[PDB]
């Protein structure tokens, strides 16, 4: 299904590339960890000096250590002598505070050095994390610009947006909150294990016994919690899909009386998401207490056995103090990792989704050749295309467009008129055949240059969040004010813009604004006109615009229609009258073609379509 | 600025305050148990080791074992109840946001947009829930550990607890200074994250327009600059965050060295025992490690604050369209439209878009509304649906004001195909069920046949179960129009509102659909917004609006002789 271990490996490899700066980060971390781990041994030596002085002060000065042990054995209870045997005290001396002070000064210097090294390592980690995050966002943007249209068509917009924006932010947050902890914990475990091996093998065995038991309990808990996490993400996706469908079509949901059904569906999906989230959170959070419990069991065992050994004289009190410090500093990294396991798990899931998006197949290898329309002649040669292979939509289609000719495309509602100009713009790849502009194949040229050469009025009008001026200048952002104003006036955008109190400054949007459907279409027309295209495609450009306004629009656009090989798709036959070439296509095939006079004389489909106005 | 965050927390954690109290009690018990284990170790050193009493060592080890069992029990209880409280808070906040958004009108919903509403119904709520969860789990440990460690130090050796009483405020002050310098950087980083997300959303929503105009280099440059700015802010935040661990550890270590020095000074005299050094070292290593743990996840606070600002912005929006006190409920509303002296002005506009509009649509008749682009036909259609409320006058459907009705029966009597429509993701049958929700396959096929949509649905191998994309973009524009028409038809409503529902149909398909609707909607009132004069001849009444007011009312023959605007339209459309 989904690869989380591989995604975690890929994320780690992106965060820690070849040994240029990651080597410096690792070395600084190792040095700081080792220097700060040495410290408890020094503190234990100071404690040993204090204990030795305090114990030896109370014994008579005339006796040696062996004589003191013998005297203690001659006394009662036997065990004080065994305790004294390992002390290495000098009776009647007391505490030498000079040695204590020197030892503590050494410890303080080492601690300062360790703090400085840790600070530098943290700064380098921040730099490298931000580098990988910038690279990740840039790669996501490039992938968005490289994907085929069927990828966006087959998915919901909100799901893709969350995979593109939310998942990257989640990766950033998880990495910035866990990477330094991870590195420090991994280094600290081995450094502390080394020092505990130095102090005493038996107690370090007792301490390292935790790792098998902790890993086993972690495996059990993670086996019980991974299905819960999968269910939580599935339910979250279902809830987000329902919310997106309800919000996007809120007018249809609201007006058609389906508001209560949407509310009930949301309630059930919200309850499912809550139950799955609670289960996943509880089981994921169970990891830290279990690790702490096993570490505390080992701590109790170490404390008891160490106290027994010190009372017997096998280990000194300062050594046991250092070992207790090391047991705490060994258990802390495991507990920290267990506590941040949930953040790591969320980040790894987000990385899995992002890498899934980044591994999607792209359109094709875009040719580096720049498009150059010398005259504007467009020709189709047996072009066949089909979405969802097995259902042909265009087959064995051919046409010739003269460099100045206005080609009109008319026909039934699902004939393939939009598909034809989408193939011309190379929005989709032709299954069989080829399309040539001025003798050069459009499949052997860069998509960017080809699409910039052709100025298209989309059938589905779209505007971005911004001013009317910005939307019109979207066609050619480098144009000056006079050109934008002229393009708006020619498309009669200026006529309704002057009415508004914020002419050219009023903000419009795809789903709203101070605009109407006809005015939105007019703005799209002006946007396409400002691009001064060499090839013009108007795919139902006046469907939402009244005939009185469209006549003036045609009068103004006669300048552009003269020498730019206009492709006109229109269900209003008056708008495509007197066109140089009229194509009538019915089921993806051009069943009849010619000018208005020849098509009328030939009768056929075009004559029937024109006679619909006259009735019968 | 975090005023809205606290209001949201206070409102939506109130049902779980008892769970929070239980979590706090269990957390303090577990933290004091973990702090008490070093105290028992100190007792082992002082009582057992210093006196050679191994039996006392074994007894205190048993005490330590019991303390560890209590600690693990309390930690498990704390994580369970914290998960319960956090997930309940998130569930309740999501429900509240969704319920408030579903009461919005068109204007209030458009003030935010569907994408923004979805994001702040899911991810903003998730961010605030994560804040609650991490506060319950890890953030409260640091104050509890600090206070409990101070009290444990007082219990162990009151003559050396001043070292903790000095070390804790010093680290607190240093961390407070770092946080004061770091929080505005985090807020700026969140602002830039919102900006880059807006750029990405704009790019994804208009990907077809981007590729049509070859705007790839411009979008790439815009994203590169936004990415660089966000990276600079994140680098500054990381610069400030990289000081928190070294300062905390330096305080730990300086406090440990001073502890050894001053404890040795006190142990040289008969004022302190050796095991208190072990106890205090563990107290430092626990208190400031808890502080270090709590300080690492501090990015979640400004993010939660801005997300709460957005959520409270949505939740503070007041709806303008409601059932007033007690809606009138006519039996089987199936009649006429009044529209008496209706005047409408869009909110935030300087001039009204409709002025003194007065015309009556008789029941069972077809009324055609004609006009220029931006005349106000869609506004009038939305006023009939009561998607917007008239500034002045009234609409008076069935002789009763649309404001006096509850908007469920008014919408059940109206089958609307809007100018800007929507087809949901799923199947054709599922989309058609929005019209009826209990329709059989036979009446589904009848509705498809009326809309001339039966051919391309039957042609699919899956028939009525042919998949439909999120907006129907796997269909042609006229196929989407015919699906919307079929959805309106399957409802069999009393009133048909065709807000330019035939602009994407060819002449033959338009004629077939219009004849089928004439056969079907003969008994139902029809209000049609059309541009072709040839199709308004069949209409019983034609309304012409220009500049936002009615310029002529009558039939086609009457209007071509008395209405200059209608005459101009007919002359323009003449063949
Ligand atoms: N939020 C808004 N939504 C729609 N129209 C608005 C809004 N704010 C102001 N208007 C104004 O409302 C007027 C009428 O808009 P409406 O959509 O009703 O026009 P129409 O004539 O029905 O449409 P079309 O352009 O398709 O013929 C426009 O001139 C527009 O400037
Ligand atoms: N992006 C798409 N994915 C799948 N099918 C599509 C897509 N775009 C168009 N079609 C299908 O192509 C068929 C005919 O092509 P189209 O250009 O839509 O016809 P026309 O321009 O005559 O309306 C329609 O039945 C439509 O459903
Ligand atoms: O369904 V259409 O012929 O308006 O592309
Ligand atoms: Mg089309
Ligand atoms: Mg309209």
Residue numbers in the entry:
A (entry chain B): 14 to 629
B (entry chain A): -2 to 572
Verbatim from the authors:
Here, we determine mycobacterial MsRv1273c/72c to be an isoniazid efflux pump and determine several structures by cryo-electron microscopy showing specific asymmetrical features including an N-terminal extending loop and a periplasmic helical hairpin only found in MsRv1272c. Together, these results indicate that the consensus site of MsRv1273c/72c is functional with normal ATPase activity while its degenerate site exhibits very low activity.
In another experiment, vanadate (Vi) was added in an attempt to trap the transporter in a conformation immediately after ATP hydrolysis. In such a state, ADP together with vanadate should stabilize the NBD dimer and trap an Occ state. After treatment with ATP and vanadate, the cryo-EM structure of MsRv1273c/72c was solved and showed an ATP | ADP+Vi-bound Occ (Vi) state at 2.7 Å resolution. Since both structures adopt a similar conformation, only the ATP-bound Occ state was analyzed and compared here. In this study, we expected to capture the OF state by using AMPPNP, vanadate or the EtoQ mutant to induce NBD closure. Our results imply that the transporter is more stable at the Occ state than the OF state when the NBDs are fully closed.
